[PDB]
Amino acid sequence: RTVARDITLLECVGKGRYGEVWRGSWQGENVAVKIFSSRDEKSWFRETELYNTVMLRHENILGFIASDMTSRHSSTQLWLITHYHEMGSLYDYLQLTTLDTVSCLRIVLSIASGLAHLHIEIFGGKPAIAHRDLKSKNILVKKNGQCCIADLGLAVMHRVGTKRYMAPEVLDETIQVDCFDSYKRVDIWAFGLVLWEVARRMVSNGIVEDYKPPFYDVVPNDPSFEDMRKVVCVDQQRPNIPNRWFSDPTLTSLAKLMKECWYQNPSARLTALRIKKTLTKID
Amino acid sequence: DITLLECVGKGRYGEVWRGSWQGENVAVKIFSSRDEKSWFRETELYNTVMLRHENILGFIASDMTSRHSSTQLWLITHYHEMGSLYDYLQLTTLDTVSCLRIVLSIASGLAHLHIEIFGKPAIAHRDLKSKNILVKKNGQCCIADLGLAVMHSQSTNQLDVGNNPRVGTKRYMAPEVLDETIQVDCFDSYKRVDIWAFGLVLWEVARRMVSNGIVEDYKPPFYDVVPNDPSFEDMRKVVCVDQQRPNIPNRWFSDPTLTSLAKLMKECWYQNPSARLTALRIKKTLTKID
Ligand SMILES: COc1cc(-c2cncc(-c3ccc(C4CCN(C)CC4)cc3)c2C)cc(OC)c1OC
Ligand SMILES: COc1cc(-c2cncc(-c3ccc(C4CCN(C)CC4)cc3)c2C)cc(OC)c1OC
Ligand SMILES: COc1cc(-c2cncc(-c3ccc(C4CCN(C)CC4)cc3)c2C)cc(OC)c1OC
Ligand SMILES: COc1cc(-c2cncc(-c3ccc(C4CCN(C)CC4)cc3)c2C)cc(OC)c1OC
């Protein structure tokens, strides 16, 4: 039989130290192609090993298509091929777009749904999975208004995370590394920061905050590990909740939720399943 | 496009196809889902650019593909029309020059695997056998199937045994594998398992080398002493309980080449793994034999 393999790379939609992401075409259909730098080969191996263990299929997880390794003269080429989401990342989307109550809740409940799917072991099924690098650049926006979680290069089944989004126990090196639940609680911290990023862009009484990343007012760009440790661990700062949120029932409820993702004590933080339940009871 | 033209092998592992790609023959292995951990391990091994060697099966691509709940696992390599050494020996006899060319090429490949390049880690194969050796039109061979391989880095003191429940082909398993006393955290243990298996492949090849008008029929190791399709315990009985080793046909002792080869394969078969020759010593010995 014929195995029509070739993907046409059409345009570069992201370039970094990780490598590059391209919009590509296969059999007349868009795919996303992540081409790994030599620097980040282990992310390709980890995500490939995970998908070789469990073929995740969930509306709020970026859809896997293929992992490809191709021999070159003097190098190995590593590609990850996934579904393509033309609206791009949540980070991208929040820069210019404002939200209403329905679109804000649909975004954050979709992320909570993807995260709970990763976290919960299913028997017969899937291992429990922690993401370890959850942030708004690792979430894509779909045309139907839901999001999906991307990049399982650091995922653990039962490179370090982005420093801006690191939980206090990672920064002060107290994390219980032998306890899988520790990794879930690190993702919940990061989820709370994403929930804050999104909620700022929800309009209430004609007011909205500009897009800012978590801790924009207390750390530099490309904050150091020490910069973050002083803010999060030593001074125990948390992102600001604007007064205008307390006039809006949705943002009042979202502020309570994000506070319950940011407890210093990791075992006090909400679970992804409890976050989903709380979000279904808002509005 | 890759075109799959004919199935050249099918078993519990999966299947291998002869295909065409960019106007050249290629081999396309499609793994069974039961053996997904071998696919991943083989892919980790082929990531190493300095693995490439005339006596190691050359890699083109590795793929995992999926839609919905089904996954395909592909390895694409160079294609060897002459097939495996196991196939080749069934029907062909050898002269001195051909016999030594085959076994020196396998020793060359195995020494390349075992010796670290400072890169390419040291590598132990763990399933060396005549079906896992391919015959090339130049009369040399190449070693195939790195799904069970173990890697070691001397500089960093790192041992990577991988995650694969697969075990070696029962017929070729060393005594310490069959009695399960092998030291699992010791890289040298895995090299010594490969040396045992190499000795068995030497014996399979040497049987097919003519001397004084005499040759033996092709037989797999231990053909005379175990059932068809021998179990793990069948092999443990003959190797560990009965202390059996392949018999040396007495006609070999009339031929200097086969006399030298019998000496070499016996030095691969010591029950004490640390007594066995290294791959490099075997290569050096075969380089000197004529
Ligand atoms: C190797 O590489 C790539 C391959 C492909 C690709 C192209 N056509 C068809 C296929 C296909 C899928 C599934 C089967 C099944 C049919 C049922 N049967 C019982 C088992 C086998 C056969 C064929 C694939 C996987 C795409 C790629 O990228 C888009 C590849 O590159 C990563
Ligand atoms: C986070 O990580 C990964 C993401 C993706 C991915 C999937 N769909 C779409 C995208 C994308 C498309 C388009 C734009 C721009 C282009 C035009 N205009 C400026 C608006 C938007 C940005 C982004 C990406 C980057 C794939 C990945 O792997 C293959 C990723 O890695 C796991
Ligand atoms: C990798 O990705 C894509 C792959 C394909 C594709 C191409 N040829 C064949 C297939 C296929 C056919 C049949 C089975 C069998 C499996 C067992 N049993 C007997 C029932 C069904 C499996 C697989 C597919 C899935 C299409 C895609 O898009 C339309 C893909 O997505 C980009
Ligand atoms: C061992 O392992 C792998 C081997 C191969 C491979 C490469 N070239 C040629 C072959 C071959 C061709 C033809 C026959 C003939 C001989 C017997 N009779 C006349 C019918 C069949 C046998 C063997 C193979 C099997 C590819 C692999 O991966 C793509 C292997 O896995 C790593």
Total length of chain B: 290
Residue A207, strand partner residues? A204
State the Cα–Cα distance between residues A153 and A40, nearest whole angstrom: 9
* Contact residues, chain B, for A41 at CB < 8 Å: 47
Rounded to 5 degrees, φ, ψ at A257 are: -65, -50
The catalytic residue positions of B are: 127
State the Cα–Cα distance between residues A115 and A135, nearest whole angstrom: 12
State the Cα–Cα distance between residues B259 and B253, nearest whole angstrom: 5
3-state secondary structure of B28: strand
* Contact residues, chain B, for A1 at CB < 8 Å: 3-4
The conformation of residue B247, written as its DSSP 8-state character, comes to P
State the Cα–Cα distance between residues A89 and B278, nearest whole angstrom: 55
User: Which of A6, A68, A100, A133 does the annotation list as catalytic?
Assistant: A133
Whether A26 is in the pocket of ligand 1, judged by its Cβ within 6 Å, is yes
**B194 with B110: CB under 8 angstroms?**
yes
Question: CA angle, B65 as apex, B63 and B69 as ends, to 5°?
Answer: 150
Beta-carbon separation of A71 and B65 below 8 A: no
**CA of A24 relative to ligand 2 center, distance in Å:** 11
Q: Which of B244-248's residues contact partners 24+ apart within 8 Å by CB, and which partners?
A: B245/B269, B246/B200, B246/B203, B246/B221, B246/B222
State the Cα–Cα distance between residues A57 and A54, nearest whole angstrom: 9
Q: Which helix (H) or strand (E) holds B129?
A: none
Q: What's the 3-state SS for chain A?
A: CEECCCCEEEEEEEECCCEEEEEEEECCEEEEEEEECHHHHHHHHHHHHHHHHCCCCCCCECCEEEEEEEECCCCEEEEEEECCCCCCEHHHHHHHCCECHHHHHHHHHHHHHHHHHHHCCECCCECCEECCCCCHHHEEECCCCCEEECCCCCCEECCCCCHHHCCHHHHCCCCCCCCHHHHHHHHHHHHHHHHHHHHCCECECCECCCCCCCCCCCCCCCCCHHHHHHHHHHCCCCCCCCHHHHHCHHHHHHHHHHHCCCCCCHHHCCCHHHHHHHHHCCC
**A154 with A216: CB under 8 angstroms?**
no
Beta-carbon separation of B62 and A69 below 8 A: yes
- The partner residue sitting opposite A5, judged by closest CB among B1, B69, B70, is B1
State the Cα–Cα distance between residues A11 and A20, nearest whole angstrom: 10
Beta-carbon separation of A76 and B47 below 8 A: yes
B45 touches chain A (CB under 8 A): no
**CA of A31 relative to ligand 2 center, distance in Å:** 10
CA distance B12 to chain A (A): 18
Sheet holding B150-153, edge to edge: B122-124, B150-153, B158-160
State the Cα–Cα distance between residues A26 and A115, nearest whole angstrom: 29
Question: What does the buried/exposed string (b/e) look like for B187-225 if buried means 16 or more CB atoms within 10 Å of the residue's CB?
Answer: bebbbbbbbbbbbbbbbbbbbbbbbeeeebebebbbeeb
- By most ligand atoms within 8 Å of CB, the mutation choice from A1, A2, A5, A6 for ligand 1 is A5
State the Cα–Cα distance between residues A269 and A134, nearest whole angstrom: 16
3-state secondary structure of B144: coil
* Contact residues, chain B, for A61 at CB < 8 Å: none
| CA-nearest residue, atom 31 of ligand 4 | B145
- B58 appears as a binding residue in the annotation: no
State the Cα–Cα distance between residues B134 and A13, nearest whole angstrom: 44
Helices and strands in chain B: count of H runs, count of E runs: 8, 10
**B198 with B285: CB under 8 angstroms?**
no
**CA of B67 relative to ligand 3 center, distance in Å:** 6
- By most ligand atoms within 8 Å of CB, the mutation choice from B33, B70, B71 for ligand 3 is B70
Judge whether A151 counts as a catalytic residue.
Answer: no
Could you tell me the two tokens for B285?
């010995």
State the Cα–Cα distance between residues B177 and B189, nearest whole angstrom: 10
Sequence-separated (6 or more) residues with CB below 8 Å from residue A83: A31, A32, A62, A63, A65, A148
